[PDB]
Amino acid sequence: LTKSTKLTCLVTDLTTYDSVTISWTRQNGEAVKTHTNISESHPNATFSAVGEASICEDDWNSGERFTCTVTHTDLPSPLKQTISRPKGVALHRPDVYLLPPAREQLNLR
Amino acid sequence: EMNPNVNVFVPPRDGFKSKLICEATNFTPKPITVSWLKDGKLVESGFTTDPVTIEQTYKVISTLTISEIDWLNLNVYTCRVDHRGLTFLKNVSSTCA
Amino acid sequence: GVAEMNPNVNVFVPPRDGFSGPAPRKSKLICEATNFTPKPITVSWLKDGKLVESGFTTDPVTIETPQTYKVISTLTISEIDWLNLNVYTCRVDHRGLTFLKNVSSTC
Numbered sequence: 025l026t027k028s029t030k031l032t033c034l035v036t037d038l039t040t041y042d043s044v045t046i047s048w049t050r051q052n053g054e055a056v057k058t059h060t061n062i063s064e065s066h067p068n069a070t071f072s073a074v075g076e077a078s079i080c081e082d083d084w085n086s087g088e089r090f091t092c093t094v095t096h097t098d099l100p101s102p103l104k105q106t107i108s109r110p111k112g113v114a115l116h117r118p119d120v121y122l123l124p125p126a127r128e129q130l131n132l133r
Numbered sequence: 134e135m136n137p138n139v140n141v142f143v144p145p146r147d148g149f150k151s152k153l154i155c156e157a158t159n160f161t162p163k164p165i166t167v168s169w170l171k172d173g174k175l176v177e178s179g180f181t182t183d184p185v186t187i188e189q190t191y192k193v194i195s196t197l198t199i200s201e202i203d204w205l206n207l208n209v210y211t212c213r214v215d216h217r218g219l220t221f222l223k224n225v226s227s228t229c230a
Numbered sequence: 231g232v233a234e235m236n237p238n239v240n241v242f243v244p245p246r247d248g249f250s251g252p253a254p255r256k257s258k259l260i261c262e263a264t265n266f267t268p269k270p271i272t273v274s275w276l277k278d279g280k281l282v283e284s285g286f287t288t289d290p291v292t293i294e295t296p297q298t299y300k301v302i303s304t305l306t307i308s309e310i311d312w313l314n315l316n317v318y319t320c321r322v323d324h325r326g327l328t329f330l331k332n333v334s335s336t337c
Contacts, residue, residue, distance in 0.1 A: 043200070043201050043202035044202070045202060095202060095205070097205050097230065100227075100229060100230050101207075102206070102207065138250075140244070140248060140257075140258070141245070141248070142242040142243065142244060142245075142248070142258075142260055143242070143243060143244065143245040143248070144242070145241055145242075145243050145334075146243075146334065146335060146336060147332075147334060147337075149240065151240075152240075154242060154260060156258075186289075225245045225247065225248070226245065227245070228245060228246040228335075228337075229337035
């Protein structure tokens with residue numbers, strides 16, 4: 025719809041610190057382009073960070089393994105989050121049904 | 134001829150950029166070479182070596198400039214000391230990271 | 231016989247594997263002040279509120295546009311004291327101003 029096939033990993037409830045960078049690594053370990061538009065802290069004393077990257081349409085449909093690594097001071101071990109399209113699934117045509125409200129609901133006006 | 138001791142200091146656990154200090158003590162003769170490594174890669178800039186002072190024993194200190202984010206990202210820093218044809222490598226990391 | 235700046239206090243501590251030698255193992259603590267003026271400065275070490283009067287060596291102040299100076303101090307510490315969650319504080323006195331920095335092994 026928008027030709028904006030980007031993927032991001034969001035971190036919440038972490039401490040409101042600085043010097044945070046989110047780098048995306050593929051299955052071969054090669055690096056990708058960086059990102060911009062770093063968000064700010066929230067009034068609830070919770071930091072928010074977003075890591076943006078640009079991938080190709082063919083790469084996503086090829087089932088490549090993409091991993092997002094978090095670099096936070098509190099966590100001693102950088103967690104790994106794997107995002108990939110599950111291949112081998114069939115395609116079905118969605119059926120859209122519209123249910124009008126019942127006559128028992130249009131009583132209180 | 135005594136092998137120099139290799140010690141690397143780390144920033145405090147509860148916060149401080151920062152600097153890395155590698156100290157070689159109780160070595161002879163006075164001339165000595167000290168370098169720095171980053172994840173097994175040679176460092177080309179960002180490090181300085183102070184003049185060797187007299188503590189007969191000598192003392193040499195080196196300073197490496199590092200960033201706050203890279204230090205806690207589990208990067209490998211190794212201090213290389215060459216003395217009398219021998220090379221010493223010490224690997225350090227953050228205890229809390 | 232141009233500017234005056236407050237001293238900066240930085241404390242260096244050994245890592246988890248920074249202890250060696252015969253038991254009990256010992257290490258060193260480094261407290262350094264940089265970009266401070268005027269030159270005179272007082273360096274003292276505090277251990278759980280107790281002043282340390284031995285086992286410390288402070289290097290002479292050396293020169294690193296406002297004039298700048300640097301000072302390096304080394305204090306010998308024991309592994310047993312470090313494992314007891316003892317807090318080490320570097321005391322800096324500069325032109326009547328006192329700056330204290332607290333470090334510990336706790337994360």
